[PDB]
Design a protein around this ligand. Structure first.
Ligand SMILES: NC(=O)c1ccc[n+]([C@@H]2O[C@H](COP(=O)([O-])OP(=O)(O)OC[C@H]3O[C@@H](n4cnc5c(N)ncnc54)[C@H](O)[C@@H]3O)[C@@H](O)[C@H]2O)c1
Ligand SMILES: NC(=O)c1ccc[n+]([C@@H]2O[C@H](COP(=O)([O-])OP(=O)(O)OC[C@H]3O[C@@H](n4cnc5c(N)ncnc54)[C@H](O)[C@@H]3O)[C@@H](O)[C@H]2O)c1
Ligand code: NA
Ligand code: NA
Lengths: 340, 341
């Protein structure tokens, strides 16, 4: 009983639920899981670096369920008509090790990342937010835009991308949402002027200063999503020093996040503690808050469980023979060598 | 992405033949072990539970990336489930694209037998002819055939606490008339006078399947069963009386039989033995121990082998695991409109 949800099936699932509800429901599910932070067997994801990218495995588990996601990060892929980010994952039973679900996670990753950013913003950004800058208008952009528009009251988005066609795509994809205005800016500095939230989702395997100190205004919240690997950043180190920085899983973020540019003792705040109301999140209206996001296995665990439950209710997905199921003699593996 | 499921792998292995599969794989493993320094190696990541473990085993070179998901639950057989279940992926390094998704439960038994064979060829006495096989479960038939067909073992003395397991082993290999397999009533009885002792028992605990009093000069121990911290088969003093060989030292220091010895206890890297940089067996009376726990490179090799074998037979099914080439790779949102939209 290993169920498989491929790309087109996930497409039908997301279409059925709706992108907005999917993100909203997922953010709520993520919030609850983050509150249960200490119940999970956590670890920094394993990364295998190459010349133009990275391939990583992201495991996590509690006492009953195990989950992991395979994911790559190759910014140069788009030049070859491939996605910068591709992923898939598995949800398994802890007491038997049996893989219950194998699922595409490329579409799901964009959804969980948007939901995670939304969850963090709901807890860290000023409640009156209405304008957001969206730097990087690629694969993640539409999801981030909708998450903030439908669930955080963002009515206006000022977008910028080195690739003008990417911005055109973003505007065209969301035009159907009349309550949301999205306009193209000629530069990052122009896009971020006067915004309440800055979301960065650029893809470039190198140290970059997308956001510089001069762009910061009192009360801003920075949703820094693009940088997510050692040697891959989007914020100038001083931007972090002028803000209260929040992270997912500190041990991993110290190596892959924006904070990799600062001393190992630079103070950061664990988001799960804020969500439990045990540690202060935003401390004032003038403060600048930064969500140093790199992605963490727990978020994939949440979306995998969500997808399994939602697909089950809709009778979606197909069964595959990935590993042996129950057998008369589980010690007779050799019998399988005689052919099906 | 192509997918090879359990029944397809069964047909594939059946067509290649278990012995040939193990032989060809051992040759391939030797080549990969020789270029050990070309791989980005790491100790597998394990998630421990009260009755088992779930692990991810990645490894990669400049061209290919591979990983295997595998569990280790000794109590599973009481629930008619396999103690070991696994599957893995072979991916392209420069794009991250997963080329092959494959069952690896059957393949794991084959690569483990091939690895044990490869080590034995370099560590056991060349005149070995009798082997003790402790643990007659899933791995046993594969280990038995690997040694019989490729290392001249003509007699195996088997023991398992479960008598039906031993009966299964004997019945499964009865067709190999050049191989004699007989049931012993205890481990001590089974290992008496053997040239090689292969242990593949499954018990999540510190076990002394083999004690020092059982050792005889010149024996080679293919210790395969223990493969996790707190899960061993050999008494620590058995190791003190031998030259010990490992796969990937950093990982084995944690999961192997040597976890019971000082961090400074000397061990020998198998790949270096194969390269001829250090000695395998040094004397006929020496006791050698291959402290085997399994390592990602072995799964990398079998995944490449399976892909090649399946490809020339046109076997495997295409699956939409991740997006492939598209007009606009930056438009992931288009996928939220349903497969029709
Ligand atoms: N934090 C997380 O959880 C998480 C999960 C999603 C993806 N990732 C990261 O998010 C980033 C974006 O992912 P994606 O799938 O949208 O990639 P993508 O390649 O589809 O889009 C990235 C966009 O950034 C633009 N860009 C690059 N450099 C720029 C610059 N200096 N200024 C303005 N625009 C620039 C590109 O032209 C491109 O359109 C990647 O770096 C990826 O690894 C992180
Ligand atoms: N080193 C490696 O690369 C590698 C790869 C294969 C599997 N593993 C390990 O190999 C072991 C066996 O795997 P399997 O698939 O054959 O499992 P299995 O459960 O099918 O068979 C194990 C057999 O051991 C027997 N056994 C348990 N305790 C015993 C004892 N004290 N004395 C004699 N027999 C005993 C059981 O009754 C059973 O028949 C497991 O512990 C597994 O984790 C290691
Ligand atoms: Na980031
Ligand atoms: Na072992």
């Amino acid at each position: 009983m290993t169920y498989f949800i491929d790309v087109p099936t996930m497409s039908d699932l997301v279409h059925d639920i709706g992108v907005a509800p999917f993100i909203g429901e997922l953010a709520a599910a993520l919030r609850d899981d983050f509150k249960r932070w200490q119940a999970f067997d956590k670890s920094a994801r394993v990364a295998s670096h190459s010349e133009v990218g990275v391939i990583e495995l992201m495991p996590v588990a509690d006492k009953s369920r195990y989950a992991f996601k395979y994911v790559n990060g190759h910014p140069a892929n788009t030049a070859r008509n491939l996605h910068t980010v591709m992923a898939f994952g598995v949800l398994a039973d802890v007491d038997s090790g049996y893989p219950v679900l194998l699922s595409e996670l490329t579409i799901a990753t964009a959804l969980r990342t948007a939901a995670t950013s939304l969850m963090a913003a709901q807890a860290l950004a000023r409640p009156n937010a209405r304008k957001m800058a969206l730097i990087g208008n690629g694969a993640q952009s539409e999801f981030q835009a909708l998450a903030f528009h439908k669930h955080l009251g963002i009515e206006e988005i000022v977008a910028y991308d080195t690739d003008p066609l990417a911005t055109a795509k973003l505007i065209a994809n969301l035009k159907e949402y009349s309550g949301l205005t999205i306009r193209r800016a000629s530069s990052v500095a122009e896009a971020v002027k006067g915004v309440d939230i800055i979301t960065t989702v650029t893809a470039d395997k190198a140290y970059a200063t997308i956001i510089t100190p001069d762009m910061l205004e009192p009360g801003m919240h920075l949703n820094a999503v693009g940088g997510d690997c050692p040697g891959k950043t989007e914020l100038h180190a001083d931007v972090l020093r002028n803000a209260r920085v929040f992270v997912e899983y500190e041990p991993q973020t110290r190596i892959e996040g924006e904070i990799q540019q600062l001393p190992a003792d630079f103070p950061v705040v664990d988001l799960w503690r804020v969500l439990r109301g045990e540690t202060e999140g935003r401390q004032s209206d003038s403060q600048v808050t930064v969500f140093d996001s790199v992605g963490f296995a727990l978020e994939d665990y949440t979306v995998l469980r969500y997808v399994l439950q939602q697909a089950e209710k809709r009778g979606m997905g197909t069964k595959i023979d990935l590993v042996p199921w129950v057998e008369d003699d589980p010690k007779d593996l050799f019998s399988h060598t005689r052919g099906r």
